């Protein structure tokens, strides 16, 4: 077993954790440290700040790492563009197309 | 009735109504002739989203891919250890 965080890649750990769904549908192998970051929904915040793909939540402007398998399960792609975080995606965007036309 | 669901357009007047990306409800987005034509050509984000955040380069061909965007969801594959590829690149 090898931690699938590319900045880590360790084969030694006290506890093997599970991460994001890989292209196979299997869950990634992460070491204790990296898997703890993932479980707290702060993996990309701790390891991916130099990468492209960050967007701000449509409602609260929280930074969300898009185009990244490690945040795929915590990011919602919104109907009219943009992204919503775990909190703000319980709601839908009201754009000017909702106007009493119905 | 209809209004273009491309938020920078919002037109209600078009020669022909077309369909875009799937919405959460399962319905397809309404798009005017112009915006729907861009979606059909696989050029929607190039035509409308270049100044938005979220763009990444394909790991193989370096095509610019608009991530975190429902309108390009269909063409972008999230790679196992990070990054993206074109759907047609990533199978390699
Ligand atoms: Zn690790
Ligand atoms: Zn990330
Ligand atoms: Zn939010
Ligand atoms: Zn339009
Ligand atoms: Zn886009
Ligand atoms: Zn490519």
Swiss-Prot record, chain A:
Protein name listed in UniProt: B3 domain-containing transcription repressor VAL1
Paired cysteines (S-S): none
Parent-protein start and end of this portion: 9 to 110 of 790
Signal sequence interval, chain numbering: none
Subunit structure: Interacts with SNL1.
Its biological purpose: Transcriptional repressor of gene expression involved in embryonic pathways, such as LEC1, ABI3, and FUS3. Repressor of the sugar-inducible genes involved in the seed maturation program in seedlings. Plays an essential role in regulating the transition from seed maturation to seedling growth. Functionally redundant with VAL2/HSL1.
Location relative to the cell: Nucleus
Expression (tissue specificity): Expressed in flowers and at lower levels in roots, stems and leaves.
Domain of life: Eukaryota
UniProtKB/Swiss-Prot annotation, chain B:
Expressing tissues: Expressed in flowers and at lower levels in roots, stems and leaves.
Membrane-traversing stretches: none
Localization terms from the record: Nucleus
Known role: Transcriptional repressor of gene expression involved in embryonic pathways, such as LEC1, ABI3, and FUS3. Repressor of the sugar-inducible genes involved in the seed maturation program in seedlings. Plays an essential role in regulating the transition from seed maturation to seedling growth. Functionally redundant with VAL2/HSL1.
Quaternary organization: Interacts with SNL1.
Official protein name in the record: B3 domain-containing transcription repressor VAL1
Whole-protein residues included: 8 to 99 of 790
């Amino acid at each position: 077993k090898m931690c699938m965080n590319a900045s880590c890649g360790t084969t030694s750990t006290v506890e093997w954790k599970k991460g994001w769904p890989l292209r196979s549908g299997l869950l990634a192998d992460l070491c204790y440290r990296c898997g703890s970051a993932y479980e707290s929904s702060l993996f990309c915040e701790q390891f991916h700040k130099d990468q492209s793909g960050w967007r701000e939540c449509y409602l609260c402007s929280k930074r969300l790492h898009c185009g990244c398998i490690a945040s795929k399960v915590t990011i919602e792609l919104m109907d009219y563009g943009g992204v919503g975080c775990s909190t703000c995606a319980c709601c839908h965007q009201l754009n000017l197309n909702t106007r009493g036309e119905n």
